[PDB]
A paper describes a structure:
The translocase of the outer mitochondrial membrane (TOM) is the entry gate for the majority of proteins imported into mitochondria as precursor proteins, or preproteins. In humans and fungi, the TOM core complex is a membrane-embedded dimer of twofold symmetry, consisting of two copies each of the β-barrel Tom40 pore, the α-helical Tom22 receptor, and the small α-helical structural subunits Tom5, Tom6, and Tom7 (3). Two other preprotein receptors, Tom20 and Tom70, are loosely bound to the TOM core, forming the TOM holo complex. We determined TOM core and holo structures with and without the bound MTS of rat aldehyde dehydrogenase (pALDH), revealing numerous interaction sites with the Tom20 receptor and the Tom40 translocation pore.
In the preparation without pALDH, iterative rounds of particle sorting produced reconstructions of both the TOM core and holo complex at 3.2 and 3.8 Å resolution, respectively. Visual comparison of the corresponding maps from both preparations revealed no differences, indicating that incubation of the isolated complex with pALDH does not induce major conformational changes. For this reason, and due to their significantly higher resolution, we focus primarily on the pALDH-bound TOM complexes, noting that any interpretation of the structures may equally apply to the complexes without bound preprotein. We generated a difference map against the unbound TOM holo map that highlights the presence of the preprotein and its binding partners. Further evaluation by 3D classification of TOM without bound preprotein revealed that Tom20 adopts various conformations, consistent with our results on the N. crassa TOM. We discern four conformations of Tom20 in the absence of a preprotein. Nevertheless, we confirm that Tom20 adopts four conformations: two central, one bent and one extended.
Residue numbers in the entry:
A (entry chain E), B (entry chain F): 8 to 50
C (entry chain J), D (entry chain I): 21 to 71
E (entry chain L), F (entry chain K): 22 to 156
G (entry chain D), H (entry chain C): 28 to 118
I (entry chain B), J (entry chain A): 21 to 256, 265, 267 to 347
K (entry chain H), L (entry chain G): 16 to 56
The structure:
Amino acid sequence: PQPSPEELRAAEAEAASTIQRAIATAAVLYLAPFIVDAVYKMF
Amino acid sequence: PQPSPEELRAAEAEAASTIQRAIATAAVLYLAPFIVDAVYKMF
Amino acid sequence: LGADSKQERISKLIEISRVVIHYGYLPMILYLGYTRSEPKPSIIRLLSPLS
Amino acid sequence: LGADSKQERISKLIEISRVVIHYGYLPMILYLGYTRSEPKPSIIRLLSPLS
Amino acid sequence: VLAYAAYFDYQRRHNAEFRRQLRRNERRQARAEKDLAEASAKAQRQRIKQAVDEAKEEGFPTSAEDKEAFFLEQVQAGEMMSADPSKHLEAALCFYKALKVYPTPGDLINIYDKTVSKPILDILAEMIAYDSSLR
Amino acid sequence: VLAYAAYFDYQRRHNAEFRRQLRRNERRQARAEKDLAEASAKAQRQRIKQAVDEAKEEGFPTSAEDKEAFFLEQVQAGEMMSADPSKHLEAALCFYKALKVYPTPGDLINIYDKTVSKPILDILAEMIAYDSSLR
Amino acid sequence: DTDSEISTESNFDPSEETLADRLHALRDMVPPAYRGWIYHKYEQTTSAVRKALSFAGRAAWTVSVTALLVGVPFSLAYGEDQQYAAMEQEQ
Amino acid sequence: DTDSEISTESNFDPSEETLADRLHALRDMVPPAYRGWIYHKYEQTTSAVRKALSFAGRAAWTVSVTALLVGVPFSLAYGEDQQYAAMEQEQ
Amino acid sequence: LSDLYDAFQERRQKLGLSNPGLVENIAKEVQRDVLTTNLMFSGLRADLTKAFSLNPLFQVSHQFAMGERLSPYTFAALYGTSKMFAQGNIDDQGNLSTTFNYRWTPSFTTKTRFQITPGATGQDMAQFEHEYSGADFTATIKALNPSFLEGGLTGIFVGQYLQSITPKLSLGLEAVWQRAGLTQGPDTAISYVGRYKTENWIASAQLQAQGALNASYWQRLGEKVQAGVDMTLSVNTKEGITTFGAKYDFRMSTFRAQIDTKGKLSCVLEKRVAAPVMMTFAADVDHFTQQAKVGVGISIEAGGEELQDQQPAPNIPF
Amino acid sequence: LSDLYDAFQERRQKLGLSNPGLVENIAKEVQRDVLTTNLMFSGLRADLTKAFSLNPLFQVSHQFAMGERLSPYTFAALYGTSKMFAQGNIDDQGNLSTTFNYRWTPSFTTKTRFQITPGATGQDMAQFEHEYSGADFTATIKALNPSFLEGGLTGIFVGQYLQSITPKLSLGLEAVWQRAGLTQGPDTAISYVGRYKTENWIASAQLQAQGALNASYWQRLGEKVQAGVDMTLSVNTKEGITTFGAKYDFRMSTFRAQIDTKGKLSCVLEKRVAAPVMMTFAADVDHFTQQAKVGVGISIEAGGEELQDQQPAPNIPF
Amino acid sequence: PITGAYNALFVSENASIVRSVVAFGLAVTFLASGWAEAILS
Amino acid sequence: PITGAYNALFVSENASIVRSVVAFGLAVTFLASGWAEAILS
Ligand SMILES: C[C@@H]1CC[C@@]2(OC1)O[C@H]1C[C@H]3[C@@H]4CC=C5C[C@@H](OCCC(CO)CO)CC[C@]5(C)[C@H]4CC[C@]3(C)[C@H]1[C@@H]2C
Ligand SMILES: C[C@@H]1CC[C@@]2(OC1)O[C@H]1C[C@H]3[C@@H]4CC=C5C[C@@H](OCCC(CO)CO)CC[C@]5(C)[C@H]4CC[C@]3(C)[C@H]1[C@@H]2C
Ligand SMILES: C[C@@H]1CC[C@@]2(OC1)O[C@H]1C[C@H]3[C@@H]4CC=C5C[C@@H](OCCC(CO)CO)CC[C@]5(C)[C@H]4CC[C@]3(C)[C@H]1[C@@H]2C
Ligand SMILES: C[C@@H]1CC[C@@]2(OC1)O[C@H]1C[C@H]3[C@@H]4CC=C5C[C@@H](OCCC(CO)CO)CC[C@]5(C)[C@H]4CC[C@]3(C)[C@H]1[C@@H]2C
Ligand SMILES: C[C@@H]1CC[C@@]2(OC1)O[C@H]1C[C@H]3[C@@H]4CC=C5C[C@@H](OCCC(CO)CO)CC[C@]5(C)[C@H]4CC[C@]3(C)[C@H]1[C@@H]2C
């Protein structure tokens, strides 16, 4: 069936939040090698 | 439709007569080369 | 002309002959070859494709 | 948001752009090659498969 | 051309008689185009009517085996003709011949309505309307 | 063995009690074989009856689009099951489900009678006889 | 087709015409009978040319595939034969 | 199953038996319950063996086609490569 | 009396005629040696042949195939001798085709063929054939499924005759008799054939009384190239097809190509990629539908090494 | 501020990382260099390629084909330069596929693709792609049929990121955003990928949040042989397939073969029968159905003689 | 001219017979005239 | 033994997953163990 407008607004917010969490992970990846460097220097 | 018995007898006779005429031609073929030889000797 | 019982028996003969040829014809050819070939191949080699 | 007349005009632009690319894209590539190749091939040879 | 077009436009804009002469010719042509369309439809309608009449003269099989074979042949013929846009009339006749032989034409019509193209259905629909004997 | 067979044959031919003992055992076995056959048919009949009952619990679609999709799916399922001799019961159920959804079951039965194999038709025929609600 | 009916368009004006109307007037310049008959021939001419191009294209494909399908195996078979002739001649 | 019903076969004779009946009597020697149960296992055993032969045959075909389909092009490609290695080594 | 028979035979011998061969071969040079019809196939094919002897001939063959109407597997074995030849081939489905030819006399041959189909019913057939090969003629009679079980002669019967008229011209005759069921009348058909043969070219024709006509022409184009053309006409509707083709004999490969009036093009390339291996590539292009069928195959013979000393037995009745 | 940016960049440079390449290539060594999936075909195929220059690259190509989902004819032409690359190919039916990549910066690339379908309606598409290639990472964004005509963003959008963690380990991310129609809610999917790369072997994986998993392993078996194995799992039902294959690099031919858990076997043989001609034979055997698809093809390049002096332009953005 | 030839060559009940026969006529001439040996070899 | 393995290997909802995973396990070992280099080259 066709969705209601508030359900659409709920989906639109959820989807945006998912991609925002993805870009947050991407930023971690861009910063990840320096973290891995520390591990070799921790021992 | 299915054939009548006299029509079958007519077909059986016709078919036999055809093959008998064939064997008559075959006999001519077996005898044919001597006829062709005469033609070369007719001139 | 022909007796119905005779036709049944004759038809049975064809069926029996059919079964024998179906099963026995190929083994017969191999037997003729295997026993008459020059030289005689090994039983394993007799039906090996390329070994 | 967007005017219906504007959407009609914009959609028409896509249709026109679609037609141009359909007919003009391949001749454009040959023109770039034919005019910029080193050396310049013959017009007959320019599309000959193997001659 | 532009000088003539400007004079033509000026005359058309300011001279009502110039428009009237042109409009009369335009109106006359509009009439001819309508009359031409009507003549073509009536002639086409006659071919559709003729096709049903032609099928009546050829007759239909009466035996179940011949009816089934004829039905399948007409369906096969209809599908084969349906691929040719010049045979829409011929395709509808084959569907009509099969439909007339099928025991439940109403059920077969629903199949044709879904499997047969509308241009053939349009001819076939008129064939059905012309053959008031179709059950 | 031959000596025993000759004695067995001699006893069977000349001793009526020897035949009676054997015949009683033979008659007893004939009874058991009939009883075994009857039990299998009734159990099979229950599965056929069960299959129609199972279809009733699952229900059938009501909308035309769902009915058409379900009909095609059941026909497709029936044909797919018809290839497996172990699914004759399952194939008949699919043909039964489609037949129950088809608007003119009588016409579809004539199609099944020609397109479906008799072993499935035999089960399907009993399914039809069990489902007295089939039109 | 009555003079009184046509008389309804008694008045006209150059400024009253819309840009689309002035552009549409350009098509009105051509006689409708001639333009309709010319357009018909245009359709017939375009269809005939397209049929010709399809036939010419279909023909070139047929000859092209024929030469490849027959010439390719042949050129290799004939070519390979020539090598044996060359090697045998060196003996 | 009544002694009076079975008593109907009161009299029998060796000569009265037909050749077919005497031959059929041979099958009667085997107990029907056992022979019926043995025949059932015979059917199950013959079906299982035929399934095994079909599987073994289908397997041999699969391995045979696999070795040919992969080994044949490979043997030629590998073989042709070896010729170039031989000709190059002669330099 | 022998007096006339001897004089007749002597007068016959002085004409210098020769045996024209089987009727079915009057077009062999075209229908099999030039046209691709007998070699075309689709999909993959592989023949593993093991030869165990050459005199007597004895070989075992495994054919693997995956394509249109090709059986996944076929086992074949054959045995041959100067006086006899027996062959059998069986499909994975048990369809068994057999052949048995025996020479009762160097001029007389009996040919027996069988085709057995198991539980699934495909009609099984029996074909008995008798051939005579005189010094200047050939006679043949066939009996396919001959039966008298119904109290009357049934089955299919064929009579064939071919006569050499001159050292180059051959004329023949064909007669058919059929009766699928005693309840229906027998059907008979006659066909006339002829051939003119020379060293460089051969022309043949086969005219059915029904109206169908098959004619072919073959000509040698040098030591390595030969080509032929075949025309077939049918009047069952009126239909006719003409096929033109050529064959090339290179040292290590044979190339065949043909085209016909129906727009079909086909080629077959057989190449000896190795001493025991022969490759085959076949392609058929239908220009009216633009569809092509590709066939790739291989043949392997591995028994030659021991077999080198021997020599094939002569005149095996293949 | 640049003070930190410079220090950050310097600290970044000292790690010795390198560009890991496009996300779609983390399995290239397996999915294209070893497995046959990208080379399999059926029927006949013939490519007639004419090269007119190497710098700038310019070549015209004619493809003839007759087989399953193969267009009877396809004309293709392409032009390339160190800064740009334009390609177009058109089917006999007018279906036109195009590509246009331009280097705005050596580290930035724009990729445009079109697919036009004439009077018959097959959806026509437009794909815009932007790629960035840093010293140690790659970023990518795609927009397929992007439209705002309905007053809201529509079409398909893809974001891709791949980061080199160590000189051998690469980790990445994938994000999808979709909205086929404004009347329905947008759908988004994320996929995680990673790769560990060494000189002798490379292992990669692609895990969808939906549950599907694609993993592959590649290893070199000497100078002329390499093989790899690919596993794919789906949980849409639970399904999985594992493919094992190897590739041989002879002097004049390359042979590829693979087998998978579904019983399929396929092989591809490419052989340089001549300097301009390359043959291809492809066969796919489905052991569960015993059916085989055969493909035979040829490629011809005839422009080299004049072209010998020149040299291909470097880093053409293919 | 063509009307009297095209009808019997492309739009008649025997068009296939004539086309097959005509094709045969050319092939035989092409072979017998020696052109094939000068062309195919 | 086999009953606890065959069920999870040939007659389960995930039989295809296990079969694909197991096949992958062998292939990787076959490559990494060096046997492939000793066999395929
Ligand atoms: C188990 C089943 C039977 C066997 C089989 O699997 C299935 O096993 C494979 C082994 C293959 C052969 C191995 C090596 C060669 C030598 C090569 O090189 C010639 C070079 C030339 C130089 O002058 C002469 O020496 C020619 C081909 C040949 C014979 C192969 C043929 C195909 C064969 C027989 C395959 C066959 C299908
Ligand atoms: C059953 C049907 C009967 C017709 C037919 O089968 C079908 O039977 C053949 C009879 C043939 C002709 C017979 C003789 C000659 C003389 C010869 O002369 C060469 C020179 C030579 C003698 O002078 C000295 O070298 C040229 C050819 C020609 C005309 C034949 C043409 C083909 C014909 C018509 C054949 C045709 C196919
Ligand atoms: C997104 C998902 C994350 C996991 C994954 O992608 C998917 O990402 C990779 C991480 C890899 C491991 C990382 C490091 C090592 C150490 C190395 O040690 C060799 C000796 C060397 C260092 O001491 C000195 O020469 C052996 C291999 C191993 C264990 C890898 C195994 C494969 C793994 C698990 C790969 C796996 C496919
Ligand atoms: C029944 C059908 C009717 C049509 C047809 O048969 C079939 O009728 C046949 C007549 C044939 C020609 C007869 C003679 C020659 C002369 C020869 O040249 C060397 C002659 C030599 C004399 O000394 C030096 O001049 C070359 C061949 C050629 C032209 C024949 C070609 C094929 C033709 C046209 C045949 C054609 C197909
Ligand atoms: C996630 C899935 C679970 C199952 C699985 O991954 C996928 O888990 C992995 C463990 C791997 C083994 C690890 C180490 C070795 C030792 C090496 O020998 C040289 C060692 C050297 C030390 O100095 C000299 O001894 C040869 C290869 C081998 C046996 C691997 C084979 C593949 C295995 C079994 C993989 C298997 C497929």
